[PDB]
Design a protein around this ligand. Structure first.
Ligand SMILES: NC(=O)c1ccc[n+]([C@@H]2O[C@H](COP(=O)([O-])OP(=O)(O)OC[C@H]3O[C@@H](n4cnc5c(N)ncnc54)[C@H](OP(=O)(O)O)[C@@H]3O)[C@@H](O)[C@H]2O)c1
Ligand SMILES: NC(=O)c1ccc[n+]([C@@H]2O[C@H](COP(=O)([O-])OP(=O)(O)OC[C@H]3O[C@@H](n4cnc5c(N)ncnc54)[C@H](OP(=O)(O)O)[C@@H]3O)[C@@H](O)[C@H]2O)c1
Lengths: 475, 475
C-alpha cells in the first residue's frame, strides 16, 4: 500500500513515469509514487477551476463537515500516516506525532473558524448609504511544501483552503510525497467532491513552473527557501495573484547575564536537535554573554551528548538523519569553513563511525564570529553555533544583522532587558525564555523571510476576498 | 512658481533633465519639472532607507502631528494645489476639489487611525505561555500613481505610509506631476524629516524599473493598469516584497425592469461624464432590460446633452478633455469599431468641431454585444455603452464574463433581485441604486483588478507588519 497514485479530479490515476522514495537512514527503497507531468498538472488545475463554482457556493457548515469527515479518516489511519513520514524521511517515531496531530488540529481549527465568520457593517459618515463588508472564496489555490514537516506543512494549507471554499492543488516535495499521497487516498475514500483537493508531485522546472505560470490559480503559497520564493513570484507574474510566502530564517538566540542557563540550554538543545535541526524557527546564532559562557557551554554539551541518534520505530529515538546528501554536504561545509576561520569544534562535526545513512552528530561550535559563512547562512542542521558577546546594545545590532526576519530568542530574568530586545528585534516572532507554537498562534516572518501567515485566524486572509455592498437609502 | 524641483532627502534639488507639462485642452506649456534619472532614483531610495530607523521609532502621536502639520499647509495652499491639477490635465475647477479634499481627508483619517492601534493578546490553550500580537512599520514603500486623480491617488498612499512609519518614495505620472511636486514643496516648507517623503518623476524603463528592481523597498504599490501591474510584480522579484495593486476594471451596470429609471440615469451619467469618464469604478457595460430600454435611453440622452464641456476656471464646466492623443485615439477606435459591428451611435462619437484640445463629446452607444471590443476592453472615456438583456440569470453571467473585479452596479426595486445580484456578482464592490466612495469605505478589486485595499483602516495592513512576543510563564 506504499505504491500510491495521483489524486486528481477525485480519482486515483497513474502516471507516465514513476519516482521511488529512498529512506535517508537505511538508503533502501521504501515506496513509489506516480510522478506527475505537465499534462497531469494541467489536469489538476482545470479540475480545481471547474469545482470552484460549486465548492465556493457550498455552505460553510457543509464544507466544515467535509473537513471533519477527512479528520475522522485521518484519526482512523494514524499509524499509516505516521509510518509514511517515518519511512520517507527517517523521522523519529515520536516526532511523527507532531506531523499527524497538526493535521487533526488544523482540520478542527478551521472547520470551527469558518462557521464563526460574520459580515460587518461600515458606518456611513454622511447618512446616505448602508455598507456591508463580507468575505468570499478567492479562487483556486496552489501550494508548494517543504519536506521538513510533510504533514504539518500540508496541514497549514489544507485546513484554511478547504474551509474558505478554495479548491487546492498541493505539490509536496519529491523527497517526502508519500504521506501527502496517503491523505489524497483518504479524500478518495470518503468521497470528497472532485477538484476540491488535488495532490501531485513532479519536477520543479516542469510541474512546479507550470502551476505558477498558469493563469488559473488565484493564490500561490510556498513553504520553502527565499530563493525559490523569488522564482515563484516572478514565474507567477503571468496573471495577478496573491502570494503567501513562509521562507528562510536566521534566528538569533541571546543568552544574557541573568538568564536561567538550565532553561536556556533545555530549550535551545531541544529545538536544535529535534528533526535534526531542520526547523525554520530554530536558533541559528546562539549569542552567549562572557560571564556565563563557560557555564552555558558545559550544560549544552551534556544535553547534546544525551541525544539518542538513529532510526528505529521500536526505540525511543530522539534525532534522525538529515534529508539527503546535498543537505549533509552543505551542513558539513559550513562547519568545516568555520574551523578554518578560528571556530572551535567542541562536539560532533562528523557522521558517526561506520554508520549507514546521512546522519550528522549533534554538533557544538564555539568562537564563531560575524564573518563566517555559518553565521550569514541558514544551517538547517543539528549544529549549535555559539558567539560570545559582552554588551547588550552590540548584540542587538548583531542579532538584526541579517536579511532574515522569522523567529528570535531572548533568555533573561531582567524585565528591562526583555522589553529592550522584544521591541527592537526585527523579527516576526520573539520567544522569551522558551518556545511555543500552535495551530491558533500566528506563525510568520518579516523582511526576506516571507509575506503571509500560517496558523491562527489570520491564515484565512489569503484565501478570502472582501466584498462591499453599498446601497443607497434615499432612493 | 510653476517650475518645481525634485524633493529627495528633505531638500529640493535639480537635475540635468526637464519635462515640460502640456495642458490637454489648450496644448500650451503650463509648467516644467526637474525630471529624475536612475541616479536620483537611488538617492531617494537610499535616503528613505536611512530614514527608516528614526521614522519608524518616532511615536505614533508624533508622526500624526507631522501629518496634521502637512494637512495645515495643504489647506493653506488649496488654490495652488487645485490650480496645478487644473493646469496639468485640464480638470474642471469644481472637480479639482475631489483631488484636494481627499488629501486632507486622508491625512485626517490615518492620523486618528494610527493613534488608536492597540496590541492584542492571544489565548494559550495550554496555559504555559503568554502571547502579545503587535504591529510595526514594515519598511520603505514605493508608489506608482495613475494620472486620472493626481492628488487623490497620492492621498491613498501618503496617508497610510506616513502614519504607519514607512518612508515613502512616490513616482507620480509623467503626465500629471505638478500637483505632487507642489506637495513635496509643502513638505520641505514645514521641515519634514529627510527621507520620510520623496517625490520624483521620470522614465518608466529607467526610473520606474530601478525602483521596483531595487532591494530597498519592502512594499510596492501601484495605481494603474493590469499589464503594468504584472510588469511590476516580475520586476520587483529581485527580493521578497509586498504588492498592493489597484488595477483595471470593467464595471457592469444592470438596470432591471423595476428600477427607478430617473435615479439610474442620474447615477450612471454623473460618473460616466465626470473626469471625462476616466474613472476606474465607472460603468463600462450598461445592461438595460427590454421593457425599459426606450425609456432609459431617452433619460440618458437628455442628461448627456446637458453636460457642459470645456476648460475655463471661471465657468461651471462639468467635463474636460481626455488625457492625451493616445487616450483620444484609443477611445475613438473602440467607438468606430463598435459601429462597424452593428452599434448605433446616438450621441457624440466625435470631437466637437473647430475646438482645440483632445475633447471627446459625451457619447451614447446602443446595440452593443459581447463580441465587440468596446465590451471586452475598459473604455476609460465619456462613452455610455448600452447592452439590452431580458433574463436576469443571463445578464448575471454576462456581467461576470470578464477578467476584471472592481466595481459593479445593480439598479432595482426588488429585494430578491438585489440580493441575487449582490451575492453572485464577482466584483469587489456592488453598488445598489447609487454610488458611494469615501476615505473610510474600503476600495478594492478582486480577480485581475489587483490585490490590496485603498481607504478604510484596511489600507494600513500593507504598511504594518505583525510581531508575536511569546514568553514562558514558568521561568
Ligand atoms: N517559514 C516557515 O514556516 C518555514 C517552514 C519550513 C521550512 N521553511 C524554510 O524552508 C527551507 C528548507 O526547505 P527546502 O530546502 O525544501 O525548500 P526549497 O528547496 O525552496 O523547496 C521548497 C518546496 O518548493 C518546491 N519547489 C522547488 N522549486 C520549485 C519551482 N521552480 N516551482 C515550484 N515548486 C518548487 C520543492 O519541491 P522539490 O522538493 O520537489 O524540489 C519543495 O517542496 C528553509 O530555508 C526553511 O527556513 C520555512
Ligand atoms: N483600482 C483603482 O483604484 C484605480 C484607480 C485609478 C486608476 N485605475 C486604473 O488605471 C488605469 C489607467 O491608468 P494609466 O493609463 O495611467 O495606467 P498605466 O499606464 O498602468 O500607468 C499607471 C502608472 O504607473 C506608471 N508606470 C508605468 N510603467 C511603469 C514602470 N515600468 N515602472 C514604474 N511605474 C510605471 C505610470 O507612469 P507614467 O504615466 O509616467 O508612465 C503611471 O503613473 C485604468 O485601467 C484604471 O482602471 C485603477
Amino acid at each position: 500500500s506504499l505504491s500510491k497514485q495521483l489524486y486528481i479530479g477525485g480519482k486515483l490515476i497513474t502516471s507516465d513515469a514513476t519516482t521511488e522514495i529512498i529512506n535517508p537512514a537505511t538508503l533502501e527503497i521504501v515506496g513509489e509514487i506516480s510522478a506527475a507531468g505537465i499534462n497531469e498538472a494541467n489536469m489538476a488545475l482545470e479540475s480545481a477551476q471547474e469545482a470552484f463554482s460549486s465548492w465556493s457556493t457550498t455552505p460553510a457548515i457543509e464544507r466544515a463537515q467535509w473537513m471533519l469527515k477527512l479528520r475522522d479518516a485521518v484519526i482512523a489511519n494514524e499509524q499509516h500516516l505516521r509510518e509514511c513520514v517515518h519511512l520517507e524521511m527517517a523521522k523519529p517515531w515520536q516526532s511523527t506525532a507532531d506531523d499527524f496531530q497538526m493535521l487533526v488540529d488544523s482540520l478542527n481549527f478551521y472547520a470551527d473558524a469558518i462557521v464563526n465568520i460574520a459580515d460587518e457593517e461600515i458606518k456611513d459618515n454622511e447618512g446616505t448609504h448602508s455598507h456591508v463588508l463580507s468575505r468570499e472564496p478567492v479562487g483556486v489555490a496552489a501550494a508548494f511544501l517543504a519536506w521538513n514537516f510533510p504533514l504539518l506543512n500540508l496541514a497549514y494549507k489544507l485546513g484554511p483552503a478547504m474551509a474558505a471554499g478554495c479548491p487546492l492543488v498541493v505539490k509536496p516535495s519529491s523527497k517526502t510525497p508519500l504521506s501527502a499521497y496517503a491523505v489524497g487516498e483518504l479524500c478518495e475514500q470518503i468521497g470528497l467532491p472532485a477538484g476540491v483537493v488535488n495532490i501531485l508531485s513532479g519536477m520543479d522546472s516542469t510541474v512546479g513552473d507550470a502551476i505558477s505560470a498558469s493563469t488559473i490559480p488565484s493564490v500561490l503559497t510556498l513553504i520553502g527557501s527565499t530563493n525559490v520564493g523569488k522564482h515563484v513570484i516572478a514565474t507567477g507574474a503571468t496573471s495577478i495573484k496573491r502570494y503567501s510566502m513562509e521562507l528562510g530564517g536566521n534566528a538569533p538566540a541571546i543568552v544574557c547575564s541573568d538568564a536561567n542557563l538550565d532553561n536556556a540550554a533545555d530549550v535551545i538543545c531541544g529545538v536544535k536537535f529535534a528533526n535534526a535541526g531542520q526547523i525554520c524557527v530554530t536558533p541559528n546564532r546562539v549569542f552567549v554573554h562572557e560571564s556565563v559562557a563557560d557555564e552555558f557551554i558545559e550544560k549544552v554539551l551534556t544535553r547534546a551528548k544525551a541525544v539518542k541518534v538513529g532510526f528505529d520505530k521500536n526505540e525511543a529515538i530522539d534525532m534522525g538523519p538529515v534529508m539527503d546528501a546535498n543537505s549533509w554536504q552543505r551542513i558539513d561545509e559550513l562547519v568545516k569553513d568555520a574551523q578554518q576561520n578560528g571556530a572551535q569544534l567542541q562536539l560532533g562535526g562528523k557522521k558517526p563511525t561506520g554508520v549507514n545513512g546521512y546522519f550528522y552528530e549533534p554538533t557544538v561550535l564555539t568562537n564563531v564570529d560575524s564573518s563566517m559563512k555559518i553565521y550569514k547562512d541558514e544551517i538547517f542542521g543539528p549544529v549549535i553555533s555559539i558567539i560570545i558577546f559582552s554588551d547588550n546594545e552590540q548584540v542587538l545590532s548583531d542579532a538584526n544583522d541579517t536579511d532574515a526576519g522569522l523567529s528570535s530568542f531572548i533568555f533573561s530574568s531582567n524585565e528591562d532587558t526583555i522589553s529592550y530586545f522584544a521591541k527592537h528585534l526585527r523579527f516576526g516572532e520573539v520567544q522569551v525564555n522558551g518556545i511555543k507554537y500552535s495551530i491558533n498562534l500566528p506563525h510568520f516572518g518579516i523582511k526576506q523571510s516571507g509575506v503571509g501567515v500560517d496558523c491562527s485566524l489570520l491564515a484565512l486572509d489569503d484565501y478570502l476576498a472582501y466584498k462591499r455592498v453599498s446601497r443607497a437609502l434615499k432612493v
